[PDB]
Structure formats: structure tokens, C-alpha cells
Design a protein around this ligand. Sequence first.
Ligand SMILES: CC(C)(COP(=O)(O)OP(=O)(O)OC[C@H]1O[C@@H](n2cnc3c(N)ncnc32)[C@H](O)[C@@H]1OP(=O)(O)O)[C@@H](O)C(=O)NCCC(=O)NCCS
Ligand SMILES: CC(C)(COP(=O)(O)OP(=O)(O)OC[C@H]1O[C@@H](n2cnc3c(N)ncnc32)[C@H](O)[C@@H]1OP(=O)(O)O)[C@@H](O)C(=O)NCCC(=O)NCCS
Ligand SMILES: CC(C)(COP(=O)(O)OP(=O)(O)OC[C@H]1O[C@@H](n2cnc3c(N)ncnc32)[C@H](O)[C@@H]1OP(=O)(O)O)[C@@H](O)C(=O)NCCC(=O)NCCS
Ligand SMILES: CC(C)(COP(=O)(O)OP(=O)(O)OC[C@H]1O[C@@H](n2cnc3c(N)ncnc32)[C@H](O)[C@@H]1OP(=O)(O)O)[C@@H](O)C(=O)NCCC(=O)NCCS
Ligand SMILES: [Mg+2]
Ligand SMILES: [Mg+2]
Ligand SMILES: [Mg+2]
Ligand SMILES: [Mg+2]
Lengths: 354, 354, 354, 354
Amino acid sequence: RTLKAAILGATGLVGIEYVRMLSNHPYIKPAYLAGKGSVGKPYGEVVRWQTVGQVPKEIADMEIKPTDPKLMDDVDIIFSPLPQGAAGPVEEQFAKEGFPVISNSPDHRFDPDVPLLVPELNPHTISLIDEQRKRREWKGFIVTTPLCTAQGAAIPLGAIFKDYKMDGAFITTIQSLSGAGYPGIPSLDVVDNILPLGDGYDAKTIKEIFRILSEVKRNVDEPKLEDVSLAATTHRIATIHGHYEVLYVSFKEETAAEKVKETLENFRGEPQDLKLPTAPSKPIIVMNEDTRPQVYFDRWAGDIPGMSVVVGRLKQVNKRMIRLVSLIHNTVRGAAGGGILAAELLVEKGYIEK
Amino acid sequence: RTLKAAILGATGLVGIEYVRMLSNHPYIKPAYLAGKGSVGKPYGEVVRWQTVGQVPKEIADMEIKPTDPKLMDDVDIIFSPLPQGAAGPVEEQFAKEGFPVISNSPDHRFDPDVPLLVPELNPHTISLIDEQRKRREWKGFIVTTPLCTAQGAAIPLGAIFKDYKMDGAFITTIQSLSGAGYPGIPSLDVVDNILPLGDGYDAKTIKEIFRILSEVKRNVDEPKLEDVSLAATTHRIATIHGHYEVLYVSFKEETAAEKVKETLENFRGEPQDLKLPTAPSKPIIVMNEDTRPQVYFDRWAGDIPGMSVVVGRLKQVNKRMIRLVSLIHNTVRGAAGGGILAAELLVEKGYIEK
Amino acid sequence: RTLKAAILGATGLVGIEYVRMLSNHPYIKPAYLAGKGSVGKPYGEVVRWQTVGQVPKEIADMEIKPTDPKLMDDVDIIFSPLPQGAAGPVEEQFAKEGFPVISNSPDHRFDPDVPLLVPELNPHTISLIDEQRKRREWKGFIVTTPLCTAQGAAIPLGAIFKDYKMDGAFITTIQSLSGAGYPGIPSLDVVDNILPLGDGYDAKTIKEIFRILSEVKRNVDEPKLEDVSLAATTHRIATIHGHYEVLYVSFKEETAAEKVKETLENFRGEPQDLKLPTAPSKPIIVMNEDTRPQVYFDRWAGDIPGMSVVVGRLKQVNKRMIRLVSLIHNTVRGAAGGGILAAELLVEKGYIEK
Amino acid sequence: RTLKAAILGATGLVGIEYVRMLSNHPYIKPAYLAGKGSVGKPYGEVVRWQTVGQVPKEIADMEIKPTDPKLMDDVDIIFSPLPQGAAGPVEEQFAKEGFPVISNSPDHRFDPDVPLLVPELNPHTISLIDEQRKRREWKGFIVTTPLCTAQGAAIPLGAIFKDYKMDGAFITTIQSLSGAGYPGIPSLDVVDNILPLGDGYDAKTIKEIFRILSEVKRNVDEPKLEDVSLAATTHRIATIHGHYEVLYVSFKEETAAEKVKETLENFRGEPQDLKLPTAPSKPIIVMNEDTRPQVYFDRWAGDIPGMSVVVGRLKQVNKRMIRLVSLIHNTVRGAAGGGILAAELLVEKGYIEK
Ligand SMILES: CC(C)(COP(=O)(O)OP(=O)(O)OC[C@H]1O[C@@H](n2cnc3c(N)ncnc32)[C@H](O)[C@@H]1OP(=O)(O)O)[C@@H](O)C(=O)NCCC(=O)NCCS
Ligand SMILES: CC(C)(COP(=O)(O)OP(=O)(O)OC[C@H]1O[C@@H](n2cnc3c(N)ncnc32)[C@H](O)[C@@H]1OP(=O)(O)O)[C@@H](O)C(=O)NCCC(=O)NCCS
Ligand SMILES: CC(C)(COP(=O)(O)OP(=O)(O)OC[C@H]1O[C@@H](n2cnc3c(N)ncnc32)[C@H](O)[C@@H]1OP(=O)(O)O)[C@@H](O)C(=O)NCCC(=O)NCCS
Ligand SMILES: CC(C)(COP(=O)(O)OP(=O)(O)OC[C@H]1O[C@@H](n2cnc3c(N)ncnc32)[C@H](O)[C@@H]1OP(=O)(O)O)[C@@H](O)C(=O)NCCC(=O)NCCS
Ligand SMILES: [Mg+2]
Ligand SMILES: [Mg+2]
Ligand SMILES: [Mg+2]
Ligand SMILES: [Mg+2]
């Protein structure tokens, strides 16, 4: 009745958050710590514990093991936050061996039969696993979570687009360094500097947000998603966790910032109704002070820390446009937290057997 | 035939750029270094030389002197980058004593008879000094330069609004710490954090930009400036100089990013035509690489370093909206450089006598 | 039964560690949040929670109250991290009123009848409290704990001095910003810079280390303390918590690094033997990798996190000299954690009573 | 007449200081920008100009060329800041071809017949070049300059060792990021952290200091060098240039701090006496304020900026021990500036010839 998870890239920056969260989870245990350049070594000795608290005592001494589908008979869930390009073949192997695969990597995010999942936003799309199982002829499956940076905007925008005639969002991000991994960003890129990431990163942000938005079940029907204008300009500075995003949001019809603020405050989905262990009770928190949120003080907010997107500064810009900022914890909600939540969602919908 | 300048707040962060630039200027000399908490002491011993190179040898040994209009008979130009609230009375005293006053402080920026001057943009408004002299009954005058952060956006927006039906701009800034002075920003506000400045700072940014824009002499006549929507969201991170601003710019009619890019590339005004010593030959530089400009590498650009606004990332967002970023050097163009340029402009229009 | 503690300076950097640690303590409650600037406001809306986790839900809504002894009669214990100069007389009045006062301020640290206490090193000096009550004519008392930066060195030099013929130490500190409070250190002192603190600060570090050393019960008696030579050169850089110190330690005779290392790993005193709730098991943890300790990763070490000094890099320099580094958490061990531990000890010794 | 220099590694951190300094040099021209990764592209579009000022207008359009001796026949002098392991054989081939090679790489720094040169301290070792040509059977030669971090200590300990009975030094370094190149140091090693470099790196610092010390002509002869005790504990933090070192210096007899201080302010050698263009007037500047030097403010010191070691904080620790700090610019003095100065000296001594 405890489910046994294998964490690929266990010692990485996303891996350690699977480690930290699961070693407190009521029924999903970090059982198998997969790696590659350090297999054979205790985890406690290779890991870069760039996160809160301490490596759990009962994890510190487990050996890092091979990422090999045929050695994991004992394993029920695979979480896969592996590098682009390597991740897609490994995830496929795993699904072909019968495993359910919850992946934080981009490789599979746009396969039409793979969900791109934000459990509060497009929970119905896990039914794509049925067409996936048939089309690919395998027993297991793959699910992906979006790009941390895309979830920072897609969540408050999902909630908004659900209930208002939102026809554009123009965003700037200032992201922290732990998203790029280790060695990831050279210190000389961000000491006394700001490092923009370029056109391919901006275009990949907007493209993930559009597929999320196109799967939101809406209460109004205008504008079409074809006519919605998105754009992002992204950057990295020297913060360790936490992506801060400034959004100007546009509408087809006059729309009051105070209305939007109430839909954000009260936003909830099936993770809240179902009470999944990792579901924050306010997946969006709204702050009211004109100097918040601040990366350092607000990235660990919520009853489940780091799982809430904290949104602030709602203000009317003109009748048809408002401004807000949102701060997500890029490796908890943006990555490991989100994938946990997804795994709980699939256990409760019977896709992963208990 | 050399003009003798007094630099108020000479040892401050803006003062030292008046010092650094003027001690190379062909005919305006840093002659009188005014201070207050350190009067009587050599400049070389109190100054925080938080800028490029070294205190000039021939300045290092001059005494810091009183900020007292009646002791400056020998002085021809006053540059005044004093703190809000103290600056306005001192500047007035100075004008009443017969001095021309070029001020970087906010106190006077919205007196209807005081120019708010960006020499490339609204050069004709120095004629407000005539109505000022009459109304206030004094011999000298006051000129102000805008808020460094407002010039970072007002310049590329001035150039744009001059020639296109620009109906909005939605901006985010990420400003460096030297604008707030010393002690200015507590280290704990920006180490591993981003510090937003709040509603009063955003509203003061947009209000300075609107008065600039309303004084641009335009080649088209739509929309009215009443119907133009501005908004800013401002922040400070741990960079030392350089304010980086992301602008989404909106239009009433279909407008191509490649058109706008040519008007920006070729933008010039009377400072360029007149050849003032401190006028960059491209007051706007356009970079083409999707990871530029970067604060650290581009804040000292241009044939007159730090005087050019470097604008990058021009890209079409939809037919009616484009995105660009601009980087200004907040204490050269945003402050001392700008005020120099203003002083050269007034010497050449005969307002300051040679 | 429960002791009720008042925390003076409760919203400050050191105050918050009192609130965070006391909120989990089996018997010392944070009952009375004292202040002055923000008296009458909820703690949670004023505090800067620049620490691990979130303000405790039970503390957040508590009103900040006057720092006034005649209003605290239901209070047992007063903890005082007030700024120099202000602390001294406030501590006195509290003592005089009948309270035990545990202070982290420098004011009384050299009164002959006042302990300067690290519970692991000079625990019998608590008996100064009896001459203290009689010559001060009060029923309360004052106890202080040492400057954080003096503790980061004295705890390892205490353990060394107890057992070896130690004749000097020559220390370099690289201290974090939280020790200076907020607004404390200007961000322009330490971005792309290192800030030395100067002679006063080096002299005061050394002077506290000597007082503590003079109170260590030793198992040898060579050399005399008056013949020991201590020096410190101190600095701050842009870390949030944690003070890293390099120590070159000298001896009167051939002394083996491997033996010191072991005397450090085996260090233990009264708090450990009594099992006080805030006593770490290993008040000195010794690390072996030639790249540790690192501030970010080792400052929250120990089974009571922040309470252990972590020491690394033990090495033979020549036969009479060894080198080590140590890392202390400056506001847990260095201030609030050590005051809590002091209060535990006084309870167990019956100096503080239900 | 003009010497034509090839700069190997010309786009790197140390390379750029060659280009910047050589572009103003009266007689050594940066004629041949060598590389490998970016051969055939303009320098200005590849380089990272992480230094003062802007790429020189004459250098920007120059093609990056092969690092190939048979293509440089018009070249006089080769300067080689190549990475360990790769430098050694490339330097050899250049020598063998007939070039003088001045190297900043560690490869040849311990060859018995190769100088390890700081022109102010062991200038006669240049005469190793004659046995070098004969036993290597080449017409060119190799000369190296020491690790920047070894220079920051050896220049002041050289001046001290020449005149006083110095029996050890015990050093703490706090080094900047540019010494590791780019991508060099991961930003997560040094944001909110300090990175020790470990034993290898401490051993190699000390070992270079000893070789240089062994070559200082002394005016005393106590103690023997083999009896001198050196130690280093080194680290990197998030500054861009400048390596700050604290030195506790030991002596065999009562030695007065005030006298050392003066021997440091009066230090001078051959480069000063010959007036070489890159020789600062005061290769050691001594500062008096108990808060200086500071990396940000004192690393570009001297009438040739970056070429002086700045020393502060001189102080008596006990009668046989003093403390000081020093600040070296690691890629000007510590690498390119010192190679230029070495080349000057060799020209004046006739080792390099028109
Ligand atoms: C998570 C991420 C940030 C990399 O972080 P990192 O901290 O640099 O992780 P790493 O590449 O160092 O390695 C983690 C472990 O995975 C292993 N790994 C790398 N490639 C592997 C592969 N092909 N197969 C198996 N394991 C692999 C590493 O060897 C290391 O293992 P070890 O402990 O055996 O030594 C990066 O993988 C990534 O960009 N992932 C896609 C998910 C994402 O969007 N992340 C950013 C979220 S904010
Ligand atoms: C320029 C500015 C950033 C302050 O910088 P700072 O580096 O903190 O300057 P300071 O307040 O320290 O002092 C500069 C000197 O001016 C003096 N000064 C302060 N108040 C004064 C007054 N009322 N009259 C005369 N001088 C005064 C100071 O005593 C000091 O003098 P000293 O050298 O005698 O000791 C701040 O004045 C400001 O915000 N100014 C308005 C202009 C602006 O927008 N600046 C930001 C531009 S990016
Ligand atoms: C902790 C310390 C670093 C300052 O930090 P801080 O976060 O800047 O502290 P503050 O100035 O903010 O003190 C905060 C509270 O104490 C209150 N306080 C200040 N002076 C006071 C006084 N004379 N009486 C009562 N309260 C006082 C402040 O008003 C504030 O209260 P509030 O919540 O009503 O607004 C500083 O007090 C100090 O240096 N203390 C000596 C103790 C120490 O431990 N130093 C080094 C720690 S590693
Ligand atoms: C300067 C140094 C710090 C590295 O910095 P960098 O900016 O990272 O240097 P690179 O790896 O970028 O070297 C840059 C150029 O040299 C070229 N280079 C590298 N290996 C080479 C080789 N074997 N042969 C020829 N060129 C080589 C690179 O391709 C690049 O050339 P490009 O412009 O064609 O692309 C590093 O080379 C080093 O540690 N050198 C030893 C010298 C030193 O002075 N160290 C400490 C200085 S304080
Ligand atoms: Mg990696
Ligand atoms: Mg000031
Ligand atoms: Mg305070
Ligand atoms: Mg490189």
C-alpha cells in the first residue's frame, strides 16, 4: 500500500526536491535513487543539497543506482527530470517496460498523446494516456509537467482565461539560476549583470503556455485561442530559487482588476477538491502589499511550501488591461512538486495502481 | 572663456560623474566641489569613487566647500543633484542669486515654467526659462533632467511617438542600486532577492514620461496623448550601474517592428546637429543579438561612454504591438551626462553666458 | 510546567530566531513579543522573516508590545538582543525588577560579576550570578553570550586550549550580512567588493575570545593565557547567514594535527551531558573534504540545526602550527540558539525557577 | 621601431588585458589575435570584454587566426595565457620555431632553465635563458610569470624577505571569478556562499611563492629559505577581478611593523629604475585607513592601473609577528600586465631584439 518511486537524476537540483518531499510523503516512498556519473556511491556523498534543511538521514546512505529499466522490477513510479535530448529515449524505454513515467523534461511535452499537465488546470487531459497506450502499444505511460517558467504565467493566466475574454499577455521574467542545473549558469554571467535567454527560450515559454491554455475547460467562449496574443522576454539573475514574472494582461471588453483578483483568490481545482497530499489549499495566493511578493520571502509560501504561485500587484492599467506579477518556486511547483501532485492525481484516477 | 561649474553633492554618486566628465570637458571646468557633512576636508579623502578609473589627481586635493550662494561669486554654472525635499529650496536660492541651475533632483520637475529636459527630445522647452524669469522675478534659472528610469523608456518612446500612432507602453524595469545613493538599498534587500519599488515609484515614472512625451514635436497627430496608456512595474536588483527596461509597445494601426527599428537607429536631435561635446553621435544604439544588451557589457556604449540608450530585441509581437528592451547608464545619461548635455545646449542657445 | 519568555527586539534578525526556535521548544514559550518602533501592530505584518520556513501561525497575529518591565509580571525569562548603548540600561532595569535576562548585546559583556557564556566552554561562570545579585542589589540577573564572530573562533580554540600548549591564533573572518541588522550593511559595500570592518572590530573580537579562554578549565597549564597571542582581521561579504573563519593556530611544542582533529570531533560539555533540548549532540562537527565547510551548505548542520560550529580543513602547517577553518551560524549558535541553551542551563542549575 | 606581438588565447579573460594594454603601448603592437574555437571570425563579435572600457576600434574587426607558428613569421613576440596541459607543448613549439614566448600558463613554471618571473623581484633569473637555448636546442625561449594568487603574496613577502629575518607567512586568500575563465566558476558556487579551492590549490600557491623567494637577492641571510614556513588557504567569492589576501607574517626576531611598512612603501626594482612603460611607479602602494584596500575601489590603483599590489592594515600582532592584507589585480599585474612588463625587461636586456 506504499508505492515505491525511483527518482532519475536523484542528485540534481530537481531530484533533490523529489527526495526532500517524498521522504515525507504518506504513501509514495523515495525508494530507488537513480544516477549515472556516480552509480555505486552513497547519495549523501555526491549530492548538492542546494535546498532547505538537510539530506534525510535514511536517504544519506543509499547507493546511487543505474538508470536501467530491467533492474527496477520492485519499482512502481518513475519520476524523470533528465536533460533534454537524453530524457525522451529513456522515458520511452521505461513506458515500454510497463512503468508509469512522470517527466519534468521537455522531450515529450508536445507529443499529442502525452499530457502536459498542470493538475489544477487541465486534469482531464490525463485521459490521453488511453490513446497513447493504444498508439504506442506499451503498458506503461508518460506524463510531462510544463516548464517551470511557463507554469509561473500559465497558472494565473489559466485561471483568468477560464472566466474572462483575455485576448493577450505580455510577460517579462526574471528567473533564478537553479533552473539551469549545475554547472548551469557561469557566475560571470550574473554577477553585476542580467542575462537574457534569447528568442528560442522566449518562443518555447509562449508555446507551452498556449498548449496549456488550449486545454483549459472555459466558462466563456471568446476570444478564440488563435486570436490570443502571447509574448515573453526572459532573463536570469543571481537568485537561487524562485522565478519572478511581470504580466500585462489584456482583454476584449472592459474588465476590472478587482474582479480578476477575486477569481484568482478563489481559484481551486480537482487537486483541492480531492484533497491530494501535495495539493496546496490555495494554489494561487494573492498578496496585497505594493512591494510583494519578493523572491526570497514568498517562494516557500502556502500550506504545502513552494506549491503555491504567489501573485501580487493587481492593478488596473486601462479598462482593458491590467498588470500583476506572479512568483513560482521553480523546482517545487515548477518541477518536482508539480510532478508529485501529478502522480497523486493519477493514483486517485486509477491510472497508477495502489 | 572656460566656464566654472560648482557641483553640489560633489561626493555623491551622481556628483562623481559630474566630476569625472567635467574634468575632461573642453570649456566647463569642475571648479567648486560643494558638500555639507564634510565641508573643510579634501575631496579625495571623503569621496566614494564607485565609478570607472580614479579620482582625477587635480581634483583629489580640493577642499569640499559650503553650499552657500553668497560665496560663489566666481561660479558660472550650478549642477544640483541634491536629495528630494532639500533640493527645491536650495535650487531656488541659487536662481534668485543669478545662477543658471541644472538640477537632477525631482523637486522642480513639474513646475510648469521649469523645463524637464531631454536635449534630444524637447529642446524647445528651454524657452520656458523666459516665462520663469518673469513669473519668479529672478535673474538666474532652473532646468531639471528627468528621472534616470523615466529617460530609459522616454527616449526610445519619444523617438517612437514622434513618428507612429503609439497608443500604449507597458514597461518593466530592473534597476541597479547606485540610483538610490549610499547607504541607499540595504544589502539584505537584494542579495538572492528582487526588491520591487511600489506604486509611488511606478506612478512617478509614468508621470515624468507623460510630460516628456507631451512636449515631443510630432510628425503624426494620432492618438492624442490623453488616450495613450502607460504603465510601469519597477524593481531594483544587485547591479551597480545600468537600468534594464523591457517595453511592450502598442499602436492604433498596424506597425512593423522593422520600421520602428530604422527610426530608432537613425534617431538624432539638435545635440547631434550642433555637435555639443557631450552629445553621443547615436543617442540611441540598436543591437541585433537576441542576448543583448546586457547591463554589464553595454552600459558604457557610445562615442561618449554611458550617454547612449542601448535598445535591443526589437521583435514583432502582433500587427499592433512590438517588444524591445532598452538599457540606460543611470548616472551618466540618466543624471550627470544628461545635465552636462543640457548645460552645453543652454550655452549654445545663449542662456548661459560664455 | 511552562516558562513564559519575553523576546526583546523580537522583529529583528536575532529576535526571529528566538521566535522560530522557541515556537518548537518543550518548555520555554515565546509569550511576549517586545518592540518599540512598531508597538501595537501584529508581529506578522511587521517582521522581516529572513530565516528558514514561515512565521509560526501562532506568532503572526500576536500584537507587538512595549519594552516595559512593569507590564510583564506573568513573564519568566527575558531575552535581550538590543543594539549597543540602548541594551545596557534596559537590561539593568529588567534585572532590577526581578527578571533573569539573557542578553546577546555587548553592553555588559565585560562587567566582572556578569557571565560571558558559551555553555559548552565556561559553564561554571554562571555562579558569578550570586555576587552579582548582592553587589547590584537585585533579585534578577544578567548573563550575556559573546559576539557571534568571537564564538566562531573561541569554541574550537576553547576545545584546543583545554588540552594543548596553544600559544597563539591568527584568524581571518568572512562574515555574513545578518549580523549587522537591517538596514545594516549598504548593498554597494559588498556587491563585487569585500568590506573590512577595521581595527575596533578586530580588537573587540580578540578581546571577547580572551575573556572566554580565561575561563576554560584546562587539563594543562602551559602556556599562561597572558602569554597567548590572538589576532583577527575581520570582513563581511554578501552571504546572508554564517561567518566563515580561517585559523592558524600556534603551539609551544610539537603538536599533531591528527590529535587536535580528534580532540575537536570528541568535544562535549555540560549541555551535551545534561541533554538540554537545544544542545546539539556534537557542538563541533568536523568535516574531512578539502572543499568544506561551505557557508551555504553547512551552516544549518547538527541535530539542532545552526547550533554546531562546523570545522574543516585541519592540517599540519609545520610541527608547531596547524590550520583550520570554522563556520558558525551567527544568529542561531552566535546569538538566539546560544541564549536559549544558556537559559536551559540556568534552569537545570536552578538559577531560573518555576 | 615597432615590435609585433601575437596574443594566444586572445578572446579569453587574460587575453583581453593584452589587447587592452597593448593597444596603448608605445612599441609592442597587438598585431596577431590568435585562437582555436573561433578561428575566422572577427574578434569583436566573439570576445567577452569583461574589462574596463570598450574593445579598441582597431582590434574589433581583426580576424581571429590559427595558433600556428609557421604563419607568424612577421611576429616578434608571442604571449601565451593558454590553459594547463595544452600550453606546455604549444609554448615549446613556438620557442623551437625561434620565438620569445612569455607565458602566463603553469606548464613550464618549474622547469629549472625557465624563469618564473616577477620583474620587480627576481629580474636576474632572465639569464636562465642562455643555458635554456643550449640545452633545449632552440633559438626562441620561454619565460613564465607566476600564478596571480602567488604574486599577490610574493610581491610583499619578497620585499619583506629581502630585508627582514622572515620565518613564515600564513595566508588567507579571497579570490575573484575571472581567474577561472569562462564558463569557469558555476554561479551556484558563489551566490550566498564562499568556495574553498582545496589542498591542491593551496599547495601550488605556496610552491610558486617558494620558488620566487628562493630567487630574491637578500641583504640579510637569516633564516635559511628551507626553514621558512608558508601556508595558504584559498577561496573564491563573487567579485569580478582582484584577489584579496590576509597575511600573518612571522620573524625570527623582534621586528617593528612601522619599519616593514616603510620598507613596503619604499619598494622599487629594475622596472622602476629602467622606467619600462608598464612599470608602475610604486609597485607596492601602502594604504593607511583601517578599512582599505577594498577590492572594488583599489584594484585599478597605480599610475599604470592594475599593476600595483596595494597593501593595507599593517600592524603589530606581537613582537615577532605582524599582519597585513594585499590586493592584486589578477589579470593585469597577476597575468597580462606582468607578461608585458617581462617583455619590456627582456627588450631592455637585449633578450628580444628588433
Ligand atoms: C534538472 C536539471 C536542472 C539538471 O540539473 P543538474 O542539477 O545539472 O542534474 P545533472 O545533469 O547534474 O545530474 C543529476 C544526475 O542525473 C544523471 N544524468 C545525467 N544524464 C543522464 C542520463 N542520460 N541518464 C541517466 N542519468 C543522467 C547525472 O549523472 C547525475 O547523476 P549521478 O548522481 O550519477 O552523478 C536539468 O536536468 C534540466 O534542465 N532538466 C529538464 C527539467 C527542467 O526543466 N529543469 C529545470 C527546472 S526549474
Ligand atoms: C544622488 C543621490 C543618488 C544621493 O547620492 P548619495 O551618493 O547618497 O549623496 P549624498 O546624500 O551622500 O551626499 C553627497 C554630498 O551632498 C551633501 N548633501 C546632502 N544634503 C545636502 C543639502 N541639503 N545641502 C547640501 N548638500 C547636501 C552631503 O552631505 C554629501 O556631502 P559631503 O561630501 O559634504 O560629505 C540622491 O541625492 C538622490 O536620490 N538625488 C536626486 C537625483 C536622482 O534622481 N538621483 C538618482 C540618479 S540615478
Ligand atoms: C539584531 C541586530 C543585528 C539589529 O537587527 P535589526 O533587525 O536591525 O534590529 P532592530 O533595529 O530592527 O531591532 C528591532 C526591534 O527592536 C526594537 N528596538 C530598537 N531599539 C530598541 C530599544 N532601545 N528598546 C526597545 N526596543 C528597541 C525596534 O524598534 C524594532 O522593534 P519593532 O518590531 O517595534 O519595530 C542589532 O539589534 C544588534 O546588533 N544587536 C546586538 C545583538 C547581536 O546579537 N548582534 C550580532 C548578531 S550575529
Ligand atoms: C585565461 C583563462 C583564465 C581561461 O579563460 P577563458 O576566458 O576561459 O579562456 P578560453 O578557454 O576561453 O581561451 C580562449 C581562447 O583561447 C583558445 N584556446 C583554448 N585552448 C587552446 C589551444 N590548445 N590552442 C590554441 N588556443 C586555445 C580558445 O578556443 C579561445 O579561442 P577563440 O577566440 O578561437 O574562441 C585560462 O585559459 C587559464 O586558466 N589560463 C592559464 C593562465 C592564467 O593566467 N590563469 C589565471 C589568470 S588570473
Ligand atoms: Mg549537471
Ligand atoms: Mg547618502
Ligand atoms: Mg534595525
Ligand atoms: Mg573558456
